[PDB]
Amino acid sequence: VPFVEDWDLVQTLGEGAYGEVQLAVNRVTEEAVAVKIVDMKNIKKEICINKMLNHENVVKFYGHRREGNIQYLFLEYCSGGELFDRIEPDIGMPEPDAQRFFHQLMAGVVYLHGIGITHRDIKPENLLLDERDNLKISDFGLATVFRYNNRERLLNKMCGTLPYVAPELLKRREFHAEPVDVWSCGIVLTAMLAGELPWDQPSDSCQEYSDWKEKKTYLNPWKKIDSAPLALLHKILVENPSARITIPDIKKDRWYNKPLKKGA
Amino acid sequence: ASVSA
């Protein structure tokens, strides 16, 4: 069938000091895909990791093609945009909706950790939504393998986004990968339920973080969060990563299992 | 603007 390999770039999804992401529409089928375009003037690694991803809550990678210095990565298109845009500033969103998004985020993280990959930059701006509002973890530009041949590798690279980063990355030379992503998911949960981030960074020098450690939950954003999810956040946002709740136990949490949301 | 697959 002629022309089936032609795609028109019709809209800029994102542009930044890293390249751009365009919505591409197939000339013949009208199928929509996102195309990440990068001027190679790192890539090999993101591609390698993207090839391993096959799960309903992680953006699928279709393949790539290069022409000289430009690489074109074809990725599953999420027409609903960023989860960040469903969060109302200083309000959050309805708790049942947050719970459903949180269940999908955990499914995607469990999947990644199961294949030994840590994302390292989980935040609402990197969690996309498809046309049925299904969450999809995206942008594996900072991702890395933390388990290979059944052997865990401790991480030491400081990366991520400060408000979402776990305390051990700012205080320890090496740390386990999984609790770091779990922490980030807790901050995303806070944002979805309060419409605001709890601190600029989790350091003792940050007053908001000291208050949390001092359990002053009468202050924002905690005072906007119901007791059930707040009890889960008390288990996730724990400073010692060895004492922090693991995903298998988050799955047993009371709020996590409470019926709240009707099906579509 | 276009690209091939």
∠ CA A145-A148-A149, rounded to 5°: 170
Neighbouring C-beta atoms of residue A153, cutoff 10 Å: 15
**Same structural domain, A144 and A237:** yes
Are residues A12 and A110 located together in one domain of the fold?
Answer: no
CA–CA separation, A157 and A225 (whole Å): 33
Check CB contact of A28 with chain B, cutoff 8 Å: no
Q: Is the same domain home to A72 and A156?
A: no
* A28 and A38 both lie in a single domain: yes
Is the Cβ pair B4, A65 closer than 8 Å? yes
Looking at residue A230, which CATH number applies to its domain?
Answer: 1.10.510.10
Locate the DSSP E strands across chain A.
Answer: 6-16, 19-26, 32-39, 61-67, 70-76, 81-82, 117-118, 127-129, 135-137, 144-145, 147-148, 151-152
Neighbours of A180 (CB within 10 A): 25
- Among A8, A63, A65, the residue with its CB nearest the CB of B2 is A8
Q: Closest Cα to residue A204, out of A189, A195, A191, A214?
A: A214
| Domain co-membership, A69 together with A99 | no
Domain with A38, as residue range(s), is 1-88
Q: Which two tokens stand for residue A198?
A: 């709890």
CA separation for the pair A237, A79 (Å, rounded): 31
Residue A37's domain is classified under what CATH number? 3.30.200.20
The answer to whether residues A155 and A175 touch, using CB atoms and an 8 Å cutoff, is yes
Rounded to the nearest 10 degrees, what angle do helices A227-236 and A177-194 cross at? 150
Phi, psi dihedrals of residue A140, rounded to the nearest 5°? -100, 25
Query: A114: which residues sit within 8 A by CB, 6+ positions away?
Result: none
Vertex A148 angle, CA A146 and A154, to 5°: 35
Query: Looking at the structure, do residues A145 and A251 belong to the same domain, yes or no?
Result: yes
Tell me, yes or no, if A121 is annotated catalytic. Answer: yes
Do A15 and A97 belong to one domain? no
Residue A37 CA, distance from chain mean position? 21
CB pairs under 8 A between A and B: 24
φ/ψ of A184, rounded to 5, equals -55, -40
CA B4 to chain A, closest CA, distance in angstroms equals 5
Q: Which of A7, A63, A74 sits opposite B2 (nearest CB)?
A: A7
Regarding whether A100 and A73 lie in a shared domain, the answer is: no
Cα–Cα dist A154/A151, whole Å: 10
Are both A240 and A198 inside the same structural domain?
A: yes
Instruction: State the smallest CA–CA distance between residue A202 and chain B in angstroms.
Output: 44
Q: Which residue, of A68, A88, A108, is where some domain finishes?
A: A88
Dist. CA A239–CA A1, nearest whole Å: 58
Q: Distance between CA atoms of A191 and A91, rounded to whole angstroms?
A: 9
* 3-state class (DSSP) for residue A12: strand
User: Is any Cβ of chain B less than 8 angstroms from the Cβ of A232?
Assistant: no
Quick check: A9 and B5 CB within 8 A? no
Query: Are A98 and A156 within one domain?
Result: yes
Place of tokens 């806070």: A190
How far is the C-alpha of A143 from the C-alpha of A112, rounded, in Å? 10
Tell whether A17 is in a known binding site. yes
Resolution in Å, one decimal, please: 1.8
**Which of the residues A97, A121, A200, A249 is marked catalytic?**
A121
Q: How many residues does chain B have?
A: 5
Angle at A181 between CA A263 and CA A185, to 5 degrees: 35
The reply to whether A102 and A67 lie within a common domain is no
Cβ neighbours of A7 (radius 10 Å): 25
H-helix or E-strand spanning residue B2: strand B2-4
Question: Is residue A250 classed as helix, strand or coil in its secondary structure?
Answer: helix
CB A61 within 8 A of CB A51: yes
Domain boundary among A88, A114, A139: A88
Helices A227-236 and A95-114, packing angle to 10 deg: 30
- Way the structure was solved: X-ray
Q: Which stretches of chain A are DSSP H helices?
A: 43-51, 95-114, 168-171, 177-194, 207-213, 227-236, 247-250
Asked whether the beta carbons of B1 and A6 are under 8 A apart, the reply is: no
Query: Which amino acid appears at position A42 of this protein?
Result: N
Identify the residue whose tokens are 């693991």.
A246
Is the bond leading into A221 cis (omega within 30 degrees of zero)? Answer: yes
Residue with tokens 């001092």: A214
**Domain ends where: A70, A88, A106?**
A88
Q: How many folded domains does chain A comprise?
A: 2
Discontinuities in chain A with C to N beyond 2.5 Å fall right after 41
User: Is residue A116 domain-shared with residue A190, that is, in the same domain?
Assistant: yes
